């Protein structure tokens, strides 16, 4: 997952989970990538699917 096109002011909300390095399950990649931005790039992908 690449978060270069982020941040994005909106995200569609279908469920396709990703597990972040903060042990939080993000509902989809747009959500995950916006958070990465908000973390100023400290948040990373740990694995695909739920944490």
């Amino acid at each position: 997952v690449d978060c270069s096109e982020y941040p994005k002011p909106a995200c569609t909300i279908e469920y396709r989970p990703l597990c972040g390095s903060d042990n939080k399950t993000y509902g989809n990649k747009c959500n995950f990538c916006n958070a990465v931005v908000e973390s100023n790039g400290t948040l990373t992908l740990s694995h695909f699917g739920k944490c």
């Binding site: 569609t12 396709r16 989809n28 747009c30 916006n34």
Partner: protein
Amino acid sequence: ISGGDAIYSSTGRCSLGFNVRSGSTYYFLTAGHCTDGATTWWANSARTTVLGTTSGSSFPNNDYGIVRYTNTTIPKDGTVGGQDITSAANATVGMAVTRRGSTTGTHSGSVTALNATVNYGGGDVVYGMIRTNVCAEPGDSGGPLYSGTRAIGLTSGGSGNCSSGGTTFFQPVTEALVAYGVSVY
């Protein structure tokens, strides 16, 4: 099964918008971004219960899709959860609305703007959207937005969340009902 209930494609999970029909043919509406690239739809994550197949999909630009029921025994309730739905209507600024999704459940709020343009990026732009202060989260896509017994919109996308609050955009359902020649019941 009814509006707000979870629906699974081969890609992920969305929510059923409203059960609709044309003559004696039953369909169900949901978000276009959910029907885009999906063929079959199931009622569970196990994929053991089939709902139907995608018959139409419009996204971006708009955000609706329709799925034809192939399952002949599953109940197809003309409600949202237990909330009967008897007609559809146009959103209005200040209108009090309620959304139901498979992730967050039911949440209420109000219409804060109409004919909004939402840019989801990469050329995915949708127009004529209803803006609201209702929250919604991943999995809620395609769920109904209603006002009493009136169908209003289909959940498309937005920002924030139900904990800290947020903004959600909806596709007017009147436009989807008209494109497909279907109607709520």
